[PDB]
Design a protein around this ligand. Structure first.
Ligand SMILES: [K+]
Ligand SMILES: [K+]
Ligand SMILES: [Mg+2]
Ligand SMILES: [Mg+2]
Ligand SMILES: [Mg+2]
Ligand SMILES: [Mg+2]
Ligand SMILES: [Mg+2]
Ligand SMILES: [Mg+2]
Ligand SMILES: [Mg+2]
Ligand SMILES: [Mg+2]
Lengths: 102, 36, 55, 49, 122, 95, 94, 82
RNA sequence: AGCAGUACAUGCUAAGACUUCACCAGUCAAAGCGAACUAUCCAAU
RNA sequence: CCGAGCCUGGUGAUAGCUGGUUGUCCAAGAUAGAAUCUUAGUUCAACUUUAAAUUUGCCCACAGAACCCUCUAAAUCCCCUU
RNA sequence: GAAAUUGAAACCUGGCGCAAUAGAUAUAGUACCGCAAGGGAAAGAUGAAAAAUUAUAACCAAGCAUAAUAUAGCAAGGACUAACCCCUAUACCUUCUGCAUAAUGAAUUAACUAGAAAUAACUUUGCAAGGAGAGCCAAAGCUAAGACCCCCGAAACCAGACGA
């Protein structure tokens, strides 16, 4: 009676757009640059590139009542940190090619 | 240049083709398997 | 339907196809049936090549 | 061969026993020595290259 | 639960006493290893069995020569308890093209480029 | 499966397979998803959409379906205005 | 017997290893013509030459790798000096 | 119901002999000739070419040539003195 | 836990993926259109 | 030996589970999982054979994988070089 | 599991059938068994001449006889001058986890006694955008061949007889 959830793509792995980076019951890894979130908190790549995991300062949305209450009660000088997953775009959006010589 | 004529030329030396010296082409017959 | 020296055709085919592949083509010569078997698809190239020779 | 010699060549075998006994005594003397003295005559090993 | 063993790096840090005992030279490390298998891989974990095969040590008491580099040493450390490691010695230098057919690896661990099979003079 | 019919001594087709599967001439088998018509009210739009897809069978299933049907069902057909005409032949398949 | 003593003299632990007793020819023609090389000796010659060639190969590969790494380091130092001052400073400095 | 077993002196000497060899193994493994950075890529060329040989062998499989002389030679089964 | 709240574009379509795993089933989803712009057969129709 | 006679035929009846299964040689070759009126059986899995096509496989450097209090160590995943 | 429709050949006197445990059960539906229906065997071997019988040599399974036996042990093996003495060796099969000195099976000899598919795929021919001696298949196919699926062993049930 067990299921498989966790990191599908580890650090430095190459992902294509739409690849599921990780599956989680709760937010253990947060969406970074070019990483989308699903309804079930699934993390997926929005661009083709290399997966990177970093530690970034956490700032919740002002309307996230539950999270805003936490940060307001923190001692001044203390910053919350979380683990974020990013995708570093490997290719350019496009190139300019000569098509005609009018 | 001679490939067909060479084979026929070789035949002249060899013994007469007969029912006693025929055989199937190698690979055309799989050996039967016997539970023995 | 190869007649004559099939081995001569094998060398001619190897010289013709080796530039295109970049390596010597793997082939089998069946002297009994007069058949040359080549690994890979070269039917279109070989047909034009044989047509030029005059076959 | 040593078993064959013991039976059919007793004089040669006694020599081999005497040679082994002599080498054994040379080993005893060397063990008592600190190495300053020279090695036994029969102790000397022929080297090959 | 038995698992793979990770030895602490300290075990592989030779001390000044070890150098005198074994005759090594930390300033000039030996280039090549002489490796022989002296223990069976039977009753040993499969990963050790695989390392022995990769190193070419399936046959016991057969000298193999390996480079003394970190990646190779990482493999040797896994099977260090099954092998004997002795530095290759070249008292006469590397064998030249002429000497290739006249070499011999002696038990001392030296590779000699001449093998006359004759007695040395006096 | 009947390998030798009583009256003709010929292999028979499993008609259960004909009812549920479409065989493309290339050897692929197409089927429907189980329950695509059942209890739609309790299924999300995304689940309902994948339930109405025409999906391929795996290799193991395809070989089994091939054994259960006779050669007639594997012949090439030229139906007029067939919706699956283009899918009968594979393209750019290296394997 | 005697395996450890033989090793102390630099000989093979087994007296059937390397040395005149094994490697020398067992026989020769009575007139003095040498006999053909024995099969075991031929195999040992091949095995030894293969071992020696591997020794050379591994040594050269390590030496070549060492030299190549040195060149990369020296180039990096030169690359630093390449762009020391492309354009002379001219603002707020006289 | 296991009866006790005891360690003989010979067994202890045998074990000590193994410990001495492995202790020396630790020493020789302590002095790598190259560091991890310098070793990198030194064997790349040979390692790649070796795989190409493996690939070349794995793509050269083809049925052997068939010769006429092989087929006609079977006629000699009935060869006899005139 | 075998439910409830409360919305009614829980519309259409479509790259790429995940999955208790084997199958069946199940899950996430860019872009685009349109909006908003904040189990099987059986039985009834 | 009739808790329902005997004989022939249906009948080489079905199930269940044992037992048996006949020359030689060479090559490869031992896994330990899921569903089921299913656990004395089976079919998809695990391992395994032959042939074929192609290109990486294994070992594994750093970096990297969570908060919630971790027994927290022994380890794992990923992974160039070799 | 059809049909419409389609539409061929066919000259008894032969056999890569058995040869006494085979081939019919068959020397015979007899002997024998059963009240009855019914069940149901076994076996023979000269030669041209037996109006040639002292003729037709013998040699071969198990079993015996010729010819019992001498410390000790799966009965052998290594051997040995020497059979034995010495040394080594826990019958086999099946099954129980990959473990039979504990459970199964076997007096012995002879005879009998058990893997039967060809759709796909592969291999080897033929021909080839076609193949095939109507039908079928075909985006290199198609035709032909080769090669794959054991033996013995319930109760019961049904039909029709036989029997107080
Ligand atoms: K009978
Ligand atoms: K009566
Ligand atoms: Mg969108
Ligand atoms: Mg084998
Ligand atoms: Mg890797
Ligand atoms: Mg009709
Ligand atoms: Mg009879
Ligand atoms: Mg018993
Ligand atoms: Mg039995
Ligand atoms: Mg009465």
């Amino acid at each position: 009676s067990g299921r498989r959830q966790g990191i599908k793509k580890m650090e430095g792995h190459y992902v294509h757009a739409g690849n599921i980076i990780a599956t989680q019951r709760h937010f253990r890894w947060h969406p970074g640059a070019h990483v989308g979130v699903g309804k079930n908190k699934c993390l997926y790549a929005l661009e083709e590139g290399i997966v990177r995991y970093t530690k970034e300062v956490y700032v919740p949305h002002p309307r996230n009542t539950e999270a805003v209450d936490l940060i307001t009660r923190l001692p001044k000088g203390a910053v919350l940190y979380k683990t974020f997953v990013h995708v570093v775009p490997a290719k350019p959006e496009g190139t300019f090619k000569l098509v005609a010589m009018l | 240049q001679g490939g067909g004529a060479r084979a026929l030329d070789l035949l002249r030396g060899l013994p007469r083709v007969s029912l006693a010296n025929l055989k199937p082409n190698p690979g055309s017959k799989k050996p039967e398997r016997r539970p023995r | 339907k190869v007649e004559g020296d099939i081995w001569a055709l094998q060398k001619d085919v190897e010289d013709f196809l080796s530039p295109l592949l970049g390596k010597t083509p793997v082939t089998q010569v069946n002297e009994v049936t007069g058949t040359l078997r080549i690994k890979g698809y070269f039917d279109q190239e070989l047909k034009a090549w044989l047509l030029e020779k005059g076959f | 061969v040593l078993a064959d010699l013991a039976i059919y060549e007793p004089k040669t075998f006694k020599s081999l026993a005497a040679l082994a006994s002599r080498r054994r005594h040379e080993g005893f003397a060397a063990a008592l020595g600190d190495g300053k003295e020279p090695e036994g005559i029969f102790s000397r090993v022929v080297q090959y290259h | 639960k038995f698992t793979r063993s990770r030895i602490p790096e300290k075990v592989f840090q030779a001390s000044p006493e070890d150098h005198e005992k074994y005759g090594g030279d930390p300033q000039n490390p030996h280039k090549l290893h002489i490796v022989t298998r002296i223990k069976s891989t039977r009753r040993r974990p499969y990963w050790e069995k695989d390392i022995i095969k990769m190193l070419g040590l399936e046959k016991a008491h057969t000298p193999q020569v390996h480079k003394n580099i970190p990646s190779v040493n990482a493999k040797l450390k896994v099977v260090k308890h099954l092998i004997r490691i002795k530095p290759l010695k070249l008292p006469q230098g590397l064998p030249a093209e002429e000497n290739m057919s006249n070499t011999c690896l002696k038990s001392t661990g030296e590779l000699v480029v001449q093998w006359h099979l004759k007695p040395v003079e006096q | 499966l009947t390998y030798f019919s009583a009256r003709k001594g010929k292999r028979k087709t499993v008609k259960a397979v004909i009812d549920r599967f479409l065989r493309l001439h290339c050897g692929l088998w197409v089927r429907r998803k189980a329950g695509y018509k059942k209890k739609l009210w309790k299924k999300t739009p995304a689940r309902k959409k994948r339930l109405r897809e025409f999906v391929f069978c795996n290799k193991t299933q395809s070989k089994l379906l091939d054994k259960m049907t006779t050669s007639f069902w594997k012949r090439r057909n030229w139906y007029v205005d067939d919706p699956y005409q283009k899918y009968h032949d594979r393209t750019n398949l290296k394997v | 017997a005697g395996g450890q003593w033989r090793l102390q003299q630099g000989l093979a632990a087994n007296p059937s290893g390397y040395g005149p007793l094994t490697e020398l020819p067992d026989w020769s023609y009575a007139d003095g013509r040498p006999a053909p090389p024995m099969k075991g000796q031929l195999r040992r010659k091949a095995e030894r030459e293969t071992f020696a060639r591997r020794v050379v190969l591994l040594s050269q590969e390590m030496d070549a790798g060492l030299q190549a790494w040195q060149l990369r380091q020296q180039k990096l130092q030169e690359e630093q000096r390449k762009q020391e001052n492309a354009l002379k400073p001219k603002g707020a400095s006289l | 119901h296991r009866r006790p077993r005891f360690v003989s002196l010979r067994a202890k000497q045998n074990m000590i002999r193994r410990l001495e060899i492995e202790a020396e193994n630790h020493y020789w493994l302590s002095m790598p000739y190259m560091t991890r950075e310098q070793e990198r890529g030194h064997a790349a060329v040979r390692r790649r070419e070796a795989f190409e040989a493996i690939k070349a062998a794995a793509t050269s499989k083809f049925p052997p040539h068939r010769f006429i002389a092989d087929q006609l030679d079977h006629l000699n089964v009935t060869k006899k003195w005139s």
